[PDB]
C-alpha cells in the first residue's frame, strides 16, 4: 500500500520491561500500531474511499495492481485511538475496547520497537515472556488474544516495494490460519475476487491468504483459555492461493502449508473444568487480573538448542499457580506443550497431528529463533462463533468424548451480531509486559 497524507500516524507509547534477574529490569520504550486492515483506504491524490463497508471500489480497483496504484492507507492520530478504535494506554497497561461507536468492531495491534519504524522482534527460545491481563469483561463468544507471528520486522517493505508504510502502518499481517480477510498482502491490495463475509458489515475475503508460523500465548475470555503452537512449512510470511492456504471451505484444512489446529494446551479441554473460571473458588479467578508467565525451554538450555517445551504458570494476588494438567485415564498428566503431549492428546481426541507433519516443536522453535512480532487483539468469530475455544466443538459432539468440550459456554453462544450488542463494552487489558531469561520476570 501507498501511504496517505490525510492523517499522521501516531502509535500509542507502551513501555515494557527487559529483565536480567528477578526484580532487576529496565524499561524499553516501545509502542503499539494498528493493523492496516482497520485503516481508511482512499485515493492517493484525494478523499475518495477505495474500500467502504465490506467492498472495494470496482472503478478504482478493477485489478490489484490498479487498486494499489490508485489507493493509499492513512494514519491513526492520537485522538482517534480511543475515539474511533477503542485503544488506550495508561502507564504500562494497554486497553482494547471491543466495540467503539463510525462503529468499529474488534482490533488487532502490533508492538513497535523504540524507533517506531520496525516491529519489536522477540527471539523467544530459552526466554520467558510475561504480562498481566484482565479478561473479566469478556464472556462467551469473545477472545482477547495475545500471540506471536512470523511477520517481517518491516512488514514486508524490503520484499515488496509497493508497501510504502511497512511496520509503521501495521502492514504484513500473516498467521497460521492463512487468512484471506487481510486487505493488503505482498504490498498489493488483496482485491481480486473479493467477497463480503455475510453478516460482517466490515470484512471480506480476497483471492490470496497470508501464511506464517504462530505462537498463541493467550486465546481467552473469562470462561476458557488456551495456549497453542502453530508451525508452518516454511515458517516465514508466505502469500498463498489454492491448496497451499489450507482453506476450510474447500476441505483443505490439513492440506496447506500451516498447522491450523495447532497443538493446544487448554485447561478445560484437557479435562480440568475447575482450574480457570469467573469466581473466587476456581484456582485462577478470571473476574480479577492475573499474571501469565510463559517459558520456552530448549533441548540444551541454550539459545542454540531446539524448542522442546512451552511451560506455563500464573500469579494472582501474589499467589503462584502452576499450570493445570491433562486429566484422562491412561494419559500422562502433562502440564506443558511438548511433541509427546501433542501426539498423546491428539491420539486420544482423534485429531490429525498436523503439528507433527509440519515439523513439530523443532519447527515452531525455528520461527521463534528468527524472531516473531507481538500481536494484541480483541475479536469475535464469524466462522465458528468461538465454540472451538469455549464450548463444545463440534456443537453436535458428545461433551463426554475427550476433545469435544472446551468450555461451559452454550453452543448457541458467540453469534457475532449478538455478542456485538451484548458485549459492546468488553475491554481486554494487557500490561506490565516483561521479557528476559527463564526465572527473571517475577
Residue numbers in the entry: 20 to 120, 124 to 464
Copy text verbatim from the article accompanying this structure deposition.
During macromolecular X-ray crystallography experiments, protein crystals held at 100 K have been widely reported to exhibit reproducible bond scission events at doses on the order of several MGy. OH-cleavage from tyrosine residues is regularly cited as amongst the most available damage pathways in protein crystals at 100 K, despite a lack of widespread reports of this phenomenon in protein crystal radiation damage studies. A systematic investigation performed on a range of protein crystal damage series deposited in the Protein Data Bank has established that Tyr –OH electron density loss is not generally a dominant damage pathway in protein crystals at 100 K. Full Tyr aromatic ring displacement is here proposed to account for instances of observable Tyr –OH electron density loss, with the original myrosinase data shown to be consistent with such a damage model. To better characterize the reproducibility of Tyr –OH group electron density loss in irradiated protein crystals, we have performed a systematic investigation on a wide range of structures at 100 K. A subset of previously conducted MX radiation damage investigations have included deposition of readily accessible coordinate and structure factor information in the Protein Data Bank (PDB), providing an ideal database of protein damage series.
Regardless of the feasibility of a radiation-induced Tyr –OH damage event within crystalline protein at 100 K, Tyr –OH density loss is in general significantly lower than for Glu and Asp carboxyl­ates for doses >1 MGy, at which de­carboxyl­ation events were reported. Prominent Tyr –OH density loss did not appear to be a widespread feature of general protein structures, a finding that is consistent with the high energetic barrier for Tyr phenolic C—O bond scission.
